[model samples]
Target: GNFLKLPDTDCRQTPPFLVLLVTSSHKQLAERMAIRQTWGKERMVKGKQLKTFFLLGTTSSAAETKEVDQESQRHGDIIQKDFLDVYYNLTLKTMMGIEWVHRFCPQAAFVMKTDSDMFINVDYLTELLLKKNRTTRFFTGFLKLNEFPIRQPFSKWFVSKSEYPWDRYPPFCSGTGYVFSGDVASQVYNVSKSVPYIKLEDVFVGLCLERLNIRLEELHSQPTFFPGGLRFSVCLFRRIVACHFIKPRTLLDYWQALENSRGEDCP
Candidate 1:
């Protein structure tokens, strides 16, 4: 375990910082690049500076396809392309980012990893994160799992009977929106080194956290958006910190709504 508690003298005044990493398949390179081009402009106005990294998977060759599955299954560490290859790429990228941060920016307060499609309110998030009570725990957008077999092949995230072979997952946060202290990042990365690869990135991360006996708490004030969802008003987001998976255009609209709501005449 790479977990090390920060010294008390270095803890109190440490500033908040964030890093965003985007991982997409080779085919989605253009889409991800487009997102990256505007990330700074979009977030700059909110007074939060972020470091961005884009990770694209290597090109696949016909010869490599045959041995890919075998490699993934046997090694259980190195990822080989599968139906869930996109997530595998993202997981690999995240692990690399964790290592990079541990080495290059060990003093950063927190690291936030999210998709290109999400819209985050950095100003509000910074305020909430800087508050006295937030520095101690892991935060995430939670989903309560029920005991029903709701996953079907026709679904967007389909797991076949022979593939997944799991009945239910313990209640865990959605992968799209989760936050952790810098100390936990390396610890989880160390755990991931030997953990058997799982198809669902969110669930696998949760399992690692469970192994470390770290519980994630749902932040009551933070809100997350799904891709292509309706724009929520600032009043609706008054207490919310981050929103995930929103379209680029919708994110603009939400920002405008928030800005206008803070007019000079209003309280």
Candidate 2:
């Protein structure tokens, strides 16, 4: 239930080094704009091509829809599917992103799925990815292992026994930010077709990868990828690929700080 359009042939002639797909809400126009003006603006990093796209779902508000249309027209980087935008529907949002990469940009060497509120250090991330040399199937970020589902009915993250009977979930990367090799995108999407749907997108992805016999690797620089909120520090911000739960204005502040601190030693 979505429309699809591939990037122009000229842009696709050469495979990109990385493709970043950001999951965003239809109403977060300001956050989307801030992202585009910040790290999301990078078209090239480390002499290799980088592409970015915002994944979104439909909103009930006509005003919000109008705003999304305006933003899409101006940026031309949003991929809006017809599904309803809600917390539990994140699996659909993330799956749409994976499917898009598999269908239109499979040649990309790496793919990352993050949220609109996260601050991504594109330069550092690109450098890290390049150093890996695309040798093995790579997937990692802040990882969660052996986490049991919350059973409380009132909890936001609650899962009923019927929904998930497992005592502990398979190791999965945090959905706040995670990266994988381009080849894994299609396999994950294809495997998803046979797996029963789960509202927790990250957990569902982990399950799909597990079925494929793939394991999530631990990043040596794991501390740099903050899956949770962090107190701001220029030096700390400089070292990481991403930080979660950032506000729109805070994103601008962090971007400015990172720019101002260029060439300064972090020690």
Candidate 3:
């Protein structure tokens, strides 16, 4: 399919959005800098001005499983115990970003949220969003519900006999990367105030949006380059917005390789 282009009137506005890179305590300052540097380069390539913010998952007094080592936790433990246990911490961090936006950068039309290890092709995405009718709606990396049988112990997201009793998950998007309109972001945050909280940050956000009756649209992701040859190449669209689970050196190498291949456009 040809590239879709939004009409001038529907292209939102100049400096349409802010990109929030959510990180954890394990990521170093130098890694953060490299991400910012690459992001700056890509933003310039797209001819869009993107305000950047780092949302760090830091220690919180309200964290539920504060004593547990996050690195060692199983999928179920992380989602059920750690996440649900630390709901307050997650909300606090998310709200901090919201407060900053409300107070200082209210004009931003949308917000792109992703993890620290992901690489985003901002130029391609800017063009795609410009073409879509959803200039004021939430857009995301959607995933279909996985059957219970498929989510067995062999899968990284595996559940065991004592894990979640549910047979399937709601049609929720992946947490790796997603974009939301400003209104939706505010609405989700606002609704979060009253909804009974859950542990999984991504799933919790989805639940909030569900309460608001907001639907998410999934985009095709690029081959998220990973070590040990674990490459994710689903949805081979030209506009691959975000890729996850990259090391710092791999990220730099990919950036360089991309730049070399595309010349000035890949930066």
Candidate 4:
């Protein structure tokens, strides 16, 4: 197998900042554009300049990548590996972001490995929820715990008993958006060498974290990460960090709505 890293470098020297490890599909160019125009746009919060990378893999469609290449040049945030973009290869996609951060940005203060389809409040996360605290190897997201596996082959998400024998999975942060300190990326990548590869990317990463003796960011007085599409008003959106299952049009609309609703009360 030939090994190849794609495009160009991101995250230069001189920043104790935020790096968004966004794992996107080769075909989802629309969502990627929405993100770039919205939350994924580069900005500074408390001097922490944000860098977003849209990680992709090879797919069967030629035009998809052609469009993606143009977008990559336009935004300069695309990073890819030479793996086939199969459904089960999501773990590989997730790994690339983890690996990228570890290799390129060891000094980064925080990294949020998020999905391209999701809406993320990088501002709130980088500035508030992940505020000045000296906890090394810190990780936090919407928590998923005590969930059983889908055993049916007909389901989109299925797990064979041979692959995972356990009755339940370890408590894991929702993959929609999970935040961790920069140091945790190295720990995850290094520890990943010994961990078994599984298609359930979130579950596998949680396994790695568990092996390293670290835990999720724990409960907060207010909520930030939500597992499904929330009917977000300006006030509600003001207080959230992650929202899953949002459409490309909806994501852009909500983001604009949030921007227009400034200086408003929560009531």
Best by TM-score: 2
- Across 210-265, the per-residue lDDT of candidate 3 in tens digits comes to 78888877443432212123353322222466667776677777777666656333
Query: What's the C-alpha lDDT at position 118 in model 2?
Result: 90
Candidate 4 lands at a TM-score of 0.92
lDDT for model 1: 0.53
- TM-score against truth, every candidate: 0.67, 0.94, 0.66, 0.92
* Tens digits of per-residue lDDT for model 4, 1-267: 122444354455565477788877777878888988989887777667887778788877888868777777777677778888877898988888788778877888788888877888777776564554744778888888777878998887799988887888887888888888888999999999798767989999999999999877653558888887788777777778888888899998988888887777676
**How big is the RMSD of model 2?**
1.8
lDDT of each: 0.53, 0.83, 0.52, 0.79
Evaluated at residue 249, the lDDT of candidate 2 is 98
True lDDT of residue 139, candidate 3:
52
RMSD of each: 8.9, 1.8, 10.8, 2.1
Find the candidate with the highest lDDT and give its number: 2
Residue 157, candidate 3: C-alpha displacement in angstroms: 7.0
Q: Which ten residues in a row have the lowest lDDT in candidate 3?
A: 1-10
Candidate 2 residue-wise lDDT at 231: 92
Candidates ranked, most accurate by TM-score first: 2, 4, 1, 3
What lDDT does candidate 1 reach at residue 240? 59
- Give the distance in Å from residue 13's predicted Cα in candidate 1 to where it truly belongs: 16
Residue-wise C-alpha lDDT for candidate 1, range 209-239, written one tens digit per residue:
7777777765554444233343465665655
Backbone clashes per model, in order? Answer: 2, 0, 5, 0
lDDT of 2 by residue, 154-247 (tens): 9988999889887888889899999999889889988998986678999999999888888887555457688778899888877688899998
Residue 104, candidate 1: how far off, in angstroms? 3.2
